[PDB]
Amino acid sequence: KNIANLVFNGNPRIQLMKDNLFKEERQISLERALLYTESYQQTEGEPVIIRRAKAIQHILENVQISIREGELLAGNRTVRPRSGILSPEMDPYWIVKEIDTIATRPQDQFVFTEADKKIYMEKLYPYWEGRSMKDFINAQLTDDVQQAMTDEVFKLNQTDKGQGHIIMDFPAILEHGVQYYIDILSDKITEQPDNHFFKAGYLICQAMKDHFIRYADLAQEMSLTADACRRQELERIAQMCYKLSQEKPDSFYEALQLLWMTSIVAQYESNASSLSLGRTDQYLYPFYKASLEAGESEAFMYEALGDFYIKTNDVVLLRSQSSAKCFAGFPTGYTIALGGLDEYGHTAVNPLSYIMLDIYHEILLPQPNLSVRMNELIPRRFLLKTCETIRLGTGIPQLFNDEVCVPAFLSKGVSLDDARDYATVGCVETSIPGRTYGLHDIALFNLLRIMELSLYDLRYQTQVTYQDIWKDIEAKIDYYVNLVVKGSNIVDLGHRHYAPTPFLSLLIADCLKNGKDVTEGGARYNFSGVQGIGQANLSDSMYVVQKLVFEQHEMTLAELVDALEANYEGKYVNLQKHVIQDFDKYGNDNDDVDDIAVKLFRHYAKELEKYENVRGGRFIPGAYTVSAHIPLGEAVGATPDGRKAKEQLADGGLSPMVGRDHLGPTAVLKSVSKLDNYLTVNGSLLNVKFQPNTLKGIEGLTKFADFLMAYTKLKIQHIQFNVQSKATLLDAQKHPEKYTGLLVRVAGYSAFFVDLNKQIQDDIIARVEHQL
Ligand SMILES: O=P(O)(O)OC[C@H]1OC[C@@H](O)[C@@H](O)[C@@H]1O
Numbered sequence: 001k002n003i004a005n006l007v008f009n010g011n012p013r014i015q016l017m018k019d020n021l022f023k024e025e026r027q028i029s030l031e032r033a034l035l036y037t038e039s040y041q042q043t044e045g046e047p048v049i050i051r052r053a054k055a056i057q058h059i060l061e062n063v064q065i066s067i068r069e070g071e072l073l074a075g076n077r078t079v080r081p082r083s084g085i086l087s088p089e090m091d092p093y094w095i096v097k098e099i100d101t102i103a104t105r106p107q108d109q110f111v112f113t114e115a116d117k118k119i120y121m122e123k124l125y126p127y128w129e130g131r132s133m134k135d136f137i138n139a140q141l142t143d144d145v146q147q148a149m150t151d152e153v154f155k156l157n158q159t160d161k162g163q164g165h166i167i168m169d170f171p172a173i174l175e176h177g178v179q180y181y182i183d184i185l186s187d188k189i190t191e192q193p194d195n196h197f198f199k200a201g202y203l204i205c206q207a208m209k210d211h212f213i214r215y216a217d218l219a220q221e222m223s224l225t226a227d228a229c230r231r232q233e234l235e236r237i238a239q240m241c242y243k244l245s246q247e248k249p250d251s252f253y254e255a256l257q258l259l260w261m262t263s264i265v266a267q268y269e270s271n272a273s274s275l276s277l278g279r280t281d282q283y284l285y286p287f288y289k290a291s292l293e294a295g296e297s298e299a300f301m302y303e304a305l306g307d308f309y310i311k312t313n314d315v316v317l318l319r320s321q322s323s324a325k326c327f328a329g330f331p332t333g334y335t336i337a338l339g340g341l342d343e344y345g346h347t348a349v350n351p352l353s354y355i356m357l358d359i360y361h362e363i364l365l366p367q368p369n370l371s372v373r374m375n376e377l378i379p380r381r382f383l384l385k386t387c388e389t390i391r392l393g394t395g396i397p398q399l400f401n402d403e404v405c406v407p408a409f410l411s412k413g414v415s416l417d418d419a420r421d422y423a424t425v426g427c428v429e430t431s432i433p434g435r436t437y438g439l440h441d442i443a444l445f446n447l448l449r450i451m452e453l454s455l456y457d458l459r460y461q462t463q464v465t466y467q468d469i470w471k472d473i474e475a476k477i478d479y480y481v482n483l484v485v486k487g488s489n490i491v492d493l494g495h496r497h498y499a500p501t502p503f504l505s506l507l508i509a510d511c512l513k514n515g516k517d518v519t520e521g522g523a524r525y526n527f528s529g530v531q532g533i534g535q536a537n538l539s540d541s542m543y544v545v546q547k548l549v550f551e552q553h554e555m556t557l558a559e560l561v562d563a564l565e566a567n568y569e570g571k572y573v574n575l576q577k578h579v580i581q582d583f584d585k586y587g588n589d590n591d592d593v594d595d596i597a598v599k600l601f602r603h604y605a606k607e608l609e610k611y612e613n614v615r616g617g618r619f620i621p622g623a624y625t626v627s628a629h630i631p632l633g634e635a636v637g638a639t640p641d642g643r644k645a646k647e648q649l650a651d652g653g654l655s656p657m658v659g660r661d662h663l664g665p666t667a668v669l670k671s672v673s674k675l676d677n678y679l680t681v682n683g684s685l686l687n688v689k690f691q692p693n694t695l696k697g698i699e700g701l702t703k704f705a706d707f708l709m710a711y712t713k714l715k716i717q718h719i720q721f722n723v724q725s726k727a728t729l730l731d732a733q734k735h736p737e738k739y740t741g742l743l744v745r746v747a748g749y750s751a752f753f754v755d756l757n758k759q760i761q762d763d764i765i766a767r768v769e770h771q772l
Contacts, residue, residue, distance in 0.1 A: 007364065166440075326628035
């Protein structure tokens with residue numbers, strides 16, 4: 001039985017709702033697909049965005065709903081907790097290939113019941129075969145794009161699922177309420193009778209009104225047969241849901257209910273990852289304050305917030321076996337940014353900011369993906385509270401640096417007001433809340449694979465120079481950025497032609513004024529975010545090449561490549577130890593290695609910003625991996641940095657390669673700070689791991705806080721921490737049953753260690769355990 005993350009004296013209601021999420025195993029759910037398909041079978045020939053809205057209305061009107069045990073807030077996608085909602089309208093093929101294996105696959109298992117297997121193949125697969133967004137993307141990708149993907153230079157994401165990766169304008173819905181949108185859309189439809197977007201949004205807002213009423217009627221009915229206390233609670237919920245079916249919220253309790261019901265409707269619409277929450281402490285604090293005045297009771301508001309936190313852990317997204325290699329362990333992305341700056345450039349930390357960290361001490365779940373915005377104005381007490389929470393060892397909260405992120409957005413034309421208000425989509429995809437359509441994880445780009453292709457290409461050139469390799473790598477980066485742009489633009493178009501999101505778009509400036517969905521470019525800011533992965537390995541490898549081959553003349557390029565092709569076996573076993581141990585590695589504050597990373601990623605960034613997306617926006621670079629450093633590593637043979645074939649790439653994005661940082665965590669910060677971190681407007685990612693003993697006591701928190709202030713001044717964009725010992729992680733591999741509660745930080749998200757495939761577990765284990 002489990003000894004990880006045991007909670008002492010937790011709130012009983014919070015702990016009961018938490019436990020209920022995990023009582024039964026995860027099942028695939030076809031309920032959304034079935035309803036979606038029913039609607040679509042009646043709307044042939046209508047505008048896609050109307051078909052979408054009517055299908056979403058049909059889902060909202062007919063989905064089975066319940067109010068689960070102890071809940072203070074209504075709203076769940078599904079009655080059975082943590083269901084994998086299938087989207088055959090995006091891709092009906094992959095589930096067929098895995099129909100008998102998804103229950104026992106290596107990552108992200110789900111039960112596909114026998115009844116549902118037959119239902120899917122009889123009622124859903126024949127309709128969606130040849131009719132899905134995936135079919136369009138298969139047909140549209142050109143030949144060189146496809147060849148780059150078979151050469152495993154880059155992956156394209158969301159070809160088989162909703163787009164997501166967007167923060168709605170929650171402050172707008174919180175101040176207006178549902179009926180306000182119904183009425184303005186009425187007037188918009190009148191003033192522009194040919195605009196389908198307005199009609200689509202009208203339908204969904206109406207169905208959201210009705211969906212509130214469904215829950216209200218259910219609460220009331222349930223109250224009749226409920227214990228003396230629960231009856232009053234269910235009556236309170238009914239009255240709340242009747243009110244919020246139309247009216248703007250007045251209390252914190254109501255704001256949380258409107259906030260999560262909006263999230264539920266958004267999930268029915270797009271069924272995607274990273275419909276993140278933005279600056280929740282900023283836009284809920286006025287409601288928390290207003291409730292305090294008026295005598296609402298901090299203990300009740302605490303429980304309602306705890307309900308909300310548990311709600312975010314009922315959502316897990318279903319994906320294919322190959323997709324689960326890149327995005328393993330349910331990175332759901334209900335990401336919250338805390339603190340930061342206000343419109344005046346003053347600290348935005350407020351009393352709710354502290355509460356939202358403290359409640360997490362009871363939750364210890366992967367969601368919400370809490371994040372603290374750092375700057376020089378952070379109150380010390382809040383900084384120490386952040387450190388105390390990270391020390392719990394779940395990986396949450398992560399940090400974002402206002403010092404980098406604000407100017408980075410200013411770089412791309414974001415106004416000062418909007419850039420000061422940034423928050424985070426998903427893992428590390430910094431974004432402008434309620435104003436951005438960023439395609440924040442549209443593609444993964446394997447920089448080490450490109451270097452490998454270049455070394456093999458030049459392997460027989462006896463006259464090759466080191467500068468020749470560099471130019472070749474830069475030329476291949478140019479070539480492949482061009483292709484990943486063309487492929488991302490196809491996926492971009494796929495979502496526009498198959499899956500506009502009219503409801504969500506209502507809450508994205510400036511879709512309502514422009515009359516356009518986000519998929520048509522209605523958002524104020526339009527990006528497409530492509531991730532450069534493997535740069536620690538790239539600079540480590542090219543440093544060896546430069547030194548071993550061209551300055552020391554130990555081998556020739558051809559002889560070295562022979563050793564790589566041989567996977568350092570046989571007569572090369574000692575060469576491997578030599579390239580690893582006898583040459584400076586990235587992450588040790590050695591300018592000579594580090595500058596290779598600086599210059600090559602700068603070339604990647606500056607190439608991406610030459611390209612437009614199909615919405616008139618700009619491509620932007622990120623440097624993050626999720627769990628893709630495993631599959632992207634598997635696609636690369638041995639490299640001059642000492643990787644054996646198929647070995648992982650450096651985790652996270654900006655992290656040193658596992659085990660290569662020998663000079664402590666501050667030398668890591670110094671390496672990372674040499675990168676031009678203003679370029680990764682799409683987000684970058686630094687994983688550090690601390691030995692738990694090194695953070696204990698008041699002394700540990702003080703060292704920890706000082707470290708985060710050094711991180712801040714060094715203008716590193718993001719950092720996050722694992723706090724677990726090697727012994728605990730090895731024990732969790734050997735006796736998973738003792739550690740079913742154990743959370744570990746992968747890359748921009750936390751996941752249950754025992755549910756991570758061994759290759760990810762082994763990455764996390766091999767990361768250096770630092771001391772302060
Ligand atoms: O395949 P998806 O889930 O759409 O994207 C992959 C991942 O991208 C980066 C993050 O936002 C994650 O939360 C998301 O899961």
